[PDB]
Design an enzyme around this catalytic site. Structure first.
Site, short mmCIF file in Angstrom:
data_model
loop_
_atom_site.label_atom_id
_atom_site.label_comp_id
_atom_site.label_asym_id
_atom_site.label_seq_id
_atom_site.Cartn_x
_atom_site.Cartn_y
_atom_site.Cartn_z
N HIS A 115 5.42 6.81 7.04
CA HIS A 115 4.97 6.47 5.70
C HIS A 115 4.40 7.73 4.72
O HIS A 115 4.25 8.68 5.62
CB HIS A 115 3.95 5.19 5.49
CG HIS A 115 2.66 5.67 6.20
ND1 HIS A 115 2.52 5.54 7.35
CD2 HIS A 115 1.71 6.27 5.68
CE1 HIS A 115 1.39 6.17 7.77
NE2 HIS A 115 0.67 6.75 6.36
N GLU A 120 -3.35 13.63 1.17
CA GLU A 120 -4.55 13.18 1.90
C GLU A 120 -5.55 14.42 2.29
O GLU A 120 -6.58 14.61 2.01
CB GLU A 120 -4.45 12.22 2.80
CG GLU A 120 -3.76 10.76 2.14
CD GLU A 120 -4.19 9.55 2.90
OE1 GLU A 120 -3.84 9.58 4.35
OE2 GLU A 120 -4.56 8.70 2.26
N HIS A 131 0.93 -1.36 0.03
CA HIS A 131 -0.19 -0.02 -0.10
C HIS A 131 0.83 1.17 -0.23
O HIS A 131 0.55 2.26 -0.76
CB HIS A 131 -1.02 0.01 1.32
CG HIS A 131 -1.80 -1.24 1.43
ND1 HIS A 131 -1.66 -2.18 2.32
CD2 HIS A 131 -2.66 -1.66 0.57
CE1 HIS A 131 -2.40 -3.09 2.29
NE2 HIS A 131 -3.25 -2.82 1.17
N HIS A 185 2.01 9.03 1.48
CA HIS A 185 1.25 8.98 0.36
C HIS A 185 1.39 10.02 -0.60
O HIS A 185 1.80 10.90 -0.39
CB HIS A 185 -0.37 9.29 0.72
CG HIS A 185 -0.71 8.56 2.11
ND1 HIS A 185 -1.77 7.48 2.13
CD2 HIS A 185 -0.56 8.81 3.52
CE1 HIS A 185 -1.73 7.03 3.35
NE2 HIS A 185 -1.01 7.73 4.37
N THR A 245 -6.38 6.60 7.81
CA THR A 245 -6.84 6.87 6.57
C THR A 245 -6.81 5.62 5.55
O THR A 245 -7.24 5.59 4.51
CB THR A 245 -6.17 8.01 5.94
OG1 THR A 245 -4.73 7.51 5.66
CG2 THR A 245 -5.89 9.14 6.59
N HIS A 302 3.20 10.91 7.25
CA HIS A 302 2.68 10.67 8.27
C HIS A 302 3.35 9.71 9.32
O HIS A 302 3.84 8.86 9.02
CB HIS A 302 1.30 9.54 8.15
CG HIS A 302 0.49 10.24 7.35
ND1 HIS A 302 -0.67 9.43 6.56
CD2 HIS A 302 0.10 11.49 7.11
CE1 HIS A 302 -1.65 10.37 6.28
NE2 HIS A 302 -1.18 11.53 6.57
N1 LIG Z 1 -2.38 6.76 6.97
S1 LIG Z 1 -2.77 6.49 8.41
O1 LIG Z 1 -3.74 6.96 9.10
O2 LIG Z 1 -1.41 6.95 9.08
N2 LIG Z 1 -2.78 4.94 8.81
C1 LIG Z 1 -2.36 3.89 9.41
N3 LIG Z 1 -2.61 2.86 9.48
C2 LIG Z 1 -1.70 1.83 10.57
C3 LIG Z 1 -1.16 3.22 11.19
O3 LIG Z 1 -1.39 4.30 10.14
ZN LIG Z 2 -0.94 7.67 6.14
#
Ligand SMILES: NS(=O)(=O)/N=C1/NCCO1
Ligand SMILES: [Zn+2]
Length: 257
Positions: free
Chosen positions: A91, A103, A61, A93, A195, A116
Site C-alpha cells: 500500500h 511517513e 485508510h 501513504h 505506522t 510499503h
Molecule cells: N503502514 S504499515 O506499517 O505497513 N502498516 C500496516 N498495517 C498492517 C500491515 O501494515
Molecule cells: Zn504503510
C-alpha cells in the site's frame, strides 16, 4: 474508529493504542549523517518473480494490493533479516500536496508518497502469529517523488476508479511488483512498528535510499480516492501518513558506504 482527521488522527491514537508512545515506533526521520554503514549487513534479496497478486481493496485508510502468501512466492531475505519473509500486501501513504505524504523523512525531507511492501516471517506460520513477535514483519519502504511517470504503477492507477470508496475491492491478478522498485537496493534499516493502529512493534524496516519517480497525474489519481463509504459525504483520501516519531534508543544502519 481511528483515522487521519483532526479528531481521530495520529495525536489521538495513543488513547486506544498506548504503544503509540512506545520505545520502537515508526516512522522516524532518517538523519543520514548519524546513520552508520554496517558491514555485517548481508546482501539484500528481493525475489518477486513468482508473485501472485489477487485483489485491490480500499480499506478506508489506504488501498491494499493483496498477494497469495500460502507458499513462498514473493519473498524478502538477506540484509538485516534472518530467514525468509513472505509478501502479503503493499500500500501507499500520500499527501494532499506534493511537498508531503511520506511517513519516513530523510534529513527532515518529506516525499510526495511512500510505498510499503509488507512481509511476514515464515518461521511464525501466519501473519497473525507473526504480529505477536519482535521479528515478525519486514516492511520494504520506497519513497515516491513527482517527476516522470512510473510505468509499473499505471495499472494500479487505472483501477482506482473502481475502488473509490471504503469497502470496495476489485480483481487485481497478474500484477508484477518488480515494476515498483528503483534501480538501487541501497537501504537504511532499523527496528520499528506498524505506522497504523494497532502500531505493533514487530517490524524490521528496510527503507530504500533511491526514490522512484511517479508523474503528477499518477499521484493526483491517488488523491481522488475516498476515505468514506459509498453513499456518505465525500472525504478525499489524502494525508494518510503518520509523522516521524521519537527515535529513542535506536540506531539506523546503512547498507552503503
Ligand atoms: N503502514 S504499515 O506499517 O505497513 N502498516 C500496516 N498495517 C498492517 C500491515 O501494515
Ligand atoms: Zn504503510
Amino acid at each position: 474508529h481511528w483515522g487521519y482527521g483532526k479528531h481521530n488522527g495520529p495525536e489521538h491514537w495513543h488513547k486506544d493504542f498506548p504503544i503509540a508512545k512506545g520505545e520502537r515506533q515508526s516512522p522516524v526521520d532518517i538523519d543520514t549523517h548519524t546513520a552508520k554503514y554496517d558491514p555485517s549487513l548481508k546482501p539484500l534479496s528481493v525475489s518477486y518473480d513468482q508473485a501472485t497478486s489477487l485483489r485491490i481493496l480500499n480499506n478506508g485508510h489506504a488501498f491494499n494490493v493483496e498477494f497469495d502468501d500460502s507458499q513462498d512466492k514473493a519473498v524478502l531475505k538477506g540484509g538485516p533479516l534472518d530467514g525468509t519473509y513472505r509478501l502479503i500486501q503493499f500500500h501507499f501513504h500520500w499527501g494532499s500536496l506534493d511537498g508531503q505524504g511520506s511517513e519516513h523523512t530523510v534529513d527532515k525531507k518529506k516525499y510526495a508518497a511512500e510505498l510499503h511492501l509488507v512481509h511476514w516471517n515464515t518461521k511464525y506460520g501466519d501473519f497473525g502469529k507473526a504480529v505477536q513477535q519482535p521479528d515478525g514483519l519486514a516492511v520494504l519502504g520506497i519513497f515516491l517523488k513527482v517527476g516522470s511517470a512510473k510505468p509499473g504503477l499505471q495499472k494500479v492507477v487505472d483501477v482506482l476508479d473502481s475502488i473509490k470508496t471504503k469497502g470496495k475491492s476489485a480483481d487485481f491478478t497478474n500484477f508484477d511488483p518488480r515494476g515498483l522498485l528503483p534501480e538501487s537496493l541501497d537501504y537504511w534499516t532499523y527496528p520499528g512498528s506498524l505506522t497504523t493502529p494497532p502500531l505493533l512493534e514487530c517490524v524490521t524496516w528496510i527503507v530504500l535510499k533511491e526514490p522512484i519517480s511517479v508523474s503528477s497525474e499518477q499521484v493526483l489519481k491517488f488523491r481522488k480516492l475516498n476515505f468514506n463509504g459509498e453513499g456518505e459525504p465525500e472525504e478525499l483520501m489524502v494525508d494518510n501518513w503518520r509523522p516521524a516519531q521519537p527515535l529513542k534508543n535506536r540506531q539506523i544502519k546503512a547498507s552503503f558506504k
